[PDB]
Amino acid sequence: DIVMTQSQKFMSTSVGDRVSITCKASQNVGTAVAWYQKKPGQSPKLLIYSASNRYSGVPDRFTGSGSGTDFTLTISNMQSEDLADYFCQQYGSYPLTFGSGTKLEIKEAEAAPTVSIFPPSSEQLTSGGASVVCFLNNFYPKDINVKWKIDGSERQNGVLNSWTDQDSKDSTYSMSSTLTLTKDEYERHNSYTCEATHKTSTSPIVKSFNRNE
Amino acid sequence: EVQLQQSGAELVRPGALVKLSCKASGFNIKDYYMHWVKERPEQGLEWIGWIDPENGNTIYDPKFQGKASITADTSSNTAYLQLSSLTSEDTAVYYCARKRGYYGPYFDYWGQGTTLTVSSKTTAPSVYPLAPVCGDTTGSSVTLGCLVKGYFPEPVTLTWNSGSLSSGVHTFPAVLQSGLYTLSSSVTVTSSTWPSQSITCNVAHPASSTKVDKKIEPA
Amino acid sequence: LANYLTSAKFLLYLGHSLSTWGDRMWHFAVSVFLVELYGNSLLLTAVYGLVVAGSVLVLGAIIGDWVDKNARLKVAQTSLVIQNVSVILCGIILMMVFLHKDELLTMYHGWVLTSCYILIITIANIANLASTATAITIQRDWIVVVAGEDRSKLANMNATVRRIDQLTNILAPMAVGQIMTYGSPVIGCGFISGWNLVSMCVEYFLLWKVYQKTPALAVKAAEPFRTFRDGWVSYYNQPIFLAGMGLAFLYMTVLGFDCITTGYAYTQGLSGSVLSILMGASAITGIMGTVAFTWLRRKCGLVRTGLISGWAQISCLILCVISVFMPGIISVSLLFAGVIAARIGLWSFDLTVTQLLQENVIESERGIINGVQNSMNYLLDLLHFIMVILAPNPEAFGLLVLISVSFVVMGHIMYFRFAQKTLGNQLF
Ligand SMILES: [Co+2]
Ligand SMILES: [Co+2]
Numbered sequence A: 001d002i003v004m005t006q007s008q009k010f011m012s013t014s015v016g017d018r019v020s021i022t023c024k025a026s027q028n029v030g031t032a033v034a035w036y037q038k039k040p041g042q043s044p045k046l047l048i049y050s051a052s053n054r055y056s057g058v059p060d061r062f063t064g065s066g067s068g069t070d071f072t073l074t075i076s077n078m079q080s081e082d083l084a085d086y087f088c089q090q091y092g093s094y095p096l097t098f099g100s101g102t103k104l105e106i107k108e109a110e111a112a113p114t115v116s117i118f119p120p121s122s123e124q125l126t127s128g129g130a131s132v133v134c135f136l137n138n139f140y141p142k143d144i145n146v147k148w149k150i151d152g153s154e155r156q157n158g159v160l161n162s163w164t165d166q167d168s169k170d171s172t173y174s175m176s177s178t179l180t181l182t183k184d185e186y187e188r189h190n191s192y193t194c195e196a197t198h199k200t201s202t203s204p205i206v207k208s209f210n211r212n213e
Numbered sequence B: 001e002v003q004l005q006q007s008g009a010e011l012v013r014p015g016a017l018v019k020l021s022c023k024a025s026g027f028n029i030k031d032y033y034m035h036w037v038k039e040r041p042e043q044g045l046e047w048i049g050w051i052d053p054e055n056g057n058t059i060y061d062p063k064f065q066g067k068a069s070i071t072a073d074t075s076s077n078t079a080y081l082q083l084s085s086l087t088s089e090d091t092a093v094y095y096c097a098r099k100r101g102y103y104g105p106y107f108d109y110w111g112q113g114t115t116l117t118v119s120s121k122t123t124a125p126s127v128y129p130l131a132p133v134c135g136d137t138t139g140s141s142v143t144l145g146c147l148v149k150g151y152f153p154e155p156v157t158l159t160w161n162s163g164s165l166s167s168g169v170h171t172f173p174a175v176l177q178s179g180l181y182t183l184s185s186s187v188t189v190t191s192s193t194w195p196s197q198s199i200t201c202n203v204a205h206p207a208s209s210t211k212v213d214k215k216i217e218p219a
Numbered sequence C: 001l002a003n004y005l006t007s008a009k010f011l012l013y014l015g016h017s018l019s020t021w022g023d024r025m026w027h028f029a030v031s032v033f034l035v036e037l038y039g040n041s042l043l044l045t046a047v048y049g050l051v052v053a054g055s056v057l058v059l060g061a062i063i064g065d066w067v068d069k070n071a072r073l074k075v076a077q078t079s080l081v082i083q084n085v086s087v088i089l090c091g092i093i094l095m096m097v098f099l100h101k102d103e104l105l106t107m108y109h110g111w112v113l114t115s116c117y118i119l120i121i122t123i124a125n126i127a128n129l130a131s132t133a134t135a136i137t138i139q140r141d142w143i144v145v146v147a148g149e150d151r152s153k154l155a156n157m158n159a160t161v162r163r164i165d166q167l168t169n170i171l172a173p174m175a176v177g178q179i180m181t182y183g184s185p186v187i188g189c190g191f192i193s194g195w196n197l198v199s200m201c202v203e204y205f206l207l208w209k210v211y212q213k214t215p216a217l218a219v220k221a222a223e224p225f226r227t228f229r230d231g232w233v234s235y236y237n238q239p240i241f242l243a244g245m246g247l248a249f250l251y252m253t254v255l256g257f258d259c260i261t262t263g264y265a266y267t268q269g270l271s272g273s274v275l276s277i278l279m280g281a282s283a284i285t286g287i288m289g290t291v292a293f294t295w296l297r298r299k300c301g302l303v304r305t306g307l308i309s310g311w312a313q314i315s316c317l318i319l320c321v322i323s324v325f326m327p328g329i330i331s332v333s334l335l336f337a338g339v340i341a342a343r344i345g346l347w348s349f350d351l352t353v354t355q356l357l358q359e360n361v362i363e364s365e366r367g368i369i370n371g372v373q374n375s376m377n378y379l380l381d382l383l384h385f386i387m388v389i390l391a392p393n394p395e396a397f398g399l400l401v402l403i404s405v406s407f408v409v410m411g412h413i414m415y416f417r418f419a420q421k422t423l424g425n426q427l428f
Helices: C010-033 C043-068 C073-098 C112-146 C153-182 C187-213 C223-229 C241-248 C290-299 C305-311 C319-325 C330-341 C343-359 C368-388 C402-409 C413-422
Strands: A010-013 A019-024 A033-038 A045-049 A062-067 A070-075 A085-090 A102-106 A129-139 A173-182 A191-196 A205-210 B003-006 B010-012 B017-025 B033-039 B045-052 B057-060 B068-073 B078-084 B092-099 B114-118 B126-128 B145-151 B169-177 B180-187 B200-205 B210-215
Touching: A010 A019, A019 A085, A045 A062, A070 A085, A129 A191, A129 B145, A129 B180, A173 B169, A173 B180, B003 B092, B010 B017, B017 B092, B017 B114, B033 B068, B033 B078, B045 B068, B045 B092, B057 B068, B078 B092, B126 B210, B145 B200, C010 C073, C010 C112, C010 C153, C010 C187, C043 C112, C043 C223, C043 C368, C073 C112, C073 C187, C112 C153, C112 C343, C112 C368, C153 C187, C153 C290, C153 C343, C241 C343, C241 C368, C241 C413, C290 C305, C290 C343, C305 C343, C305 C413, C319 C330, C319 C402, C330 C343, C343 C368
Parallel strands: A010 A102, B010 B114
Antiparallel strands: A019 A070, A033 A045, A033 A085, A062 A070, A085 A102, A129 A173, A191 A205, B003 B017, B017 B078, B033 B045, B033 B092, B045 B057, B068 B078, B092 B114, B126 B145, B145 B180, B169 B180, B200 B210
16 A cells, blocks of 8 residues: 655744655655645644645645655745644545654754652652652753663663643743652662753753652 | 534443444535544544445445444434444544545545543542752752642643642643553742742542642642 | 426537537538548548547647636637537538539649548548537536536436437438438538538527526636646546546447448448448447446446446457357347447446546646547547558458457456555455
């Protein structure tokens, strides 16, 4: 089956910039490729069909181009109503397949997280489990890595990281990992550390607490 | 005005059946082909099949040919999809779409989407939370936080200070664990209200009416 | 009912019946003008065919892109005016030379008996270009806009247009024959000129009416050699391409009933079992193939309508094949049971592809892809004439069927590849 592919999951853009999203078939579709845009929590709306036609009623800054196997949607002078997901459908043959999508994102400068470690709570401590949270907030680029070093032992198991979506006021991000140990596990060990290996600085931002405290 | 309205928000024990509906308004279901599409949580769109309402011919994606049955009723002007032998993998948003030819260039009109949840759990939330401040030298912003965990199956709206909060209120998207859920939310502002007269977290799980408050005391 | 008689769906059947009647009387007139000249039907008839086929093979895409980029009423009326003016202008020459025959007036190369044939063929070619433009626009555009969004009403309009073609292809030659044998074949040609002149104005009016009565038609959405490849790659980039080629292959056929009356039609007398019934039976299986389409299309759909209308044609042409071998007069019995009982699958397949091209082709490209399908249809009709000439010997016929049945089986593989790719590789 024809497997539409979109290399970039993310594109960092700015308002008034020309952004070109690329889509690549797995066989010769011809001009059988349409472009949908969906915003979070909505249904996909048309933009461009047969790889060049502009559906009736979409602004004139959306352009589409390509033929054969390699196609392109092109936003000229991007506005702030364009930050969305875009995907290419092929109707050359059944089963229909969609492109896996390409999420736009306004591009900021750079920043480093304000790591903040918080030791287990009393009521949770009596609840057969102790979860230690670290709250990396107001970060720069999306990606980051945490360090679950209990007694300087990187624990890859029992972690859970959840990142926000780019804030509409600062285009930053935030994240939060939580090592979920047992009430017998938090006891038999002594150290608890979290470190953030973000690109902002080669000196990792490591925060830690002491079970003695 | 052409619309497709869908039944919404089903929650189904695994191994059961479910039927999802898509009611057209402003056109004839019979002049079109009706397509079903699935969007998994953080995943790409997938095509399930179409039905020709005139003669009732259905075509499926070979990976749905076992456990998808698309039917239609022109008299009611409505199309249906039946999912059988449900599993954890089935949770997704199902869309009903409308195409004109066998090779129509596009899906002009789409359904609102129907979230389907396949799980075997149901409980209340456990709100445990505390600020930490010890051995510190100069306070950052006292950075208080909250942790709602083990929620049986609902969308919590933990908001702090009861609208007295600030833009300094980051709500981390929830995630599943042992078939329960877990969330978190952090606040960091006004380094003067740390230690002194401060605010509290209030989280309310509707499906269990767990509207509980918890004022975070110092270390 | 006075309520159906004024519908735009009927002022379209009427304006189409008139055009088809004019075209067909004029074709039979030009076919009896080719008897005041070389009496043979091989060299000069096939060259008339080669000329009209080449002209449309070249200009199909330019005509199509002219149908698109311009308008809907101006296109229909320009094409109507051009065809009827060229028809009266050919009929006048036909008469002014159908009287004064064999009078060489000058001795130079502009002499009469050949400048007459050249002029008749040029004007007939312009008439055919204009009538192809009218076919494109009216059928592929106004039937699809008038029929609205109704896949069972459009089926009926398509089958109705075809039934009108099929009964006119019989009744028009007989009417013009009674006129041309009643008094004389000069007043006949003058009469077809006058008929075409008045029906020009009648159809002008009928088109203007159908335009006022459906407001959805007023809504529109090296340049020559440029728009020749800007239409032949589009027609190739289409997902429906493989069906419009499987149809084009059913035109390179010698077993088409009209051509078998030319060669291998001897030893049978007229009005006993030839033009009274064998010409009237092939008009019955042409109506009996358009009523199977609208029926099958409801029961089993429009892609399996082409799959049964294909193993029907192929299975009746296994009669024209067992003929030329006669394994266990007879031979002419079967060859005509095949040519006639295989028009059920040919007129039912022509209608699925016509309807796949109608709802699966974008409105903006609706005239271009429909010109390039015409050119594809003649490119294979041309290679039909190239094969009857240089192979006209009676002995060399046993092979003009086997290589005319093989282009059938090869046009129903390019549809079985279309079907198996559209609805279930393993599901049928
Ligand atoms: Co004609
Ligand atoms: Co012939």
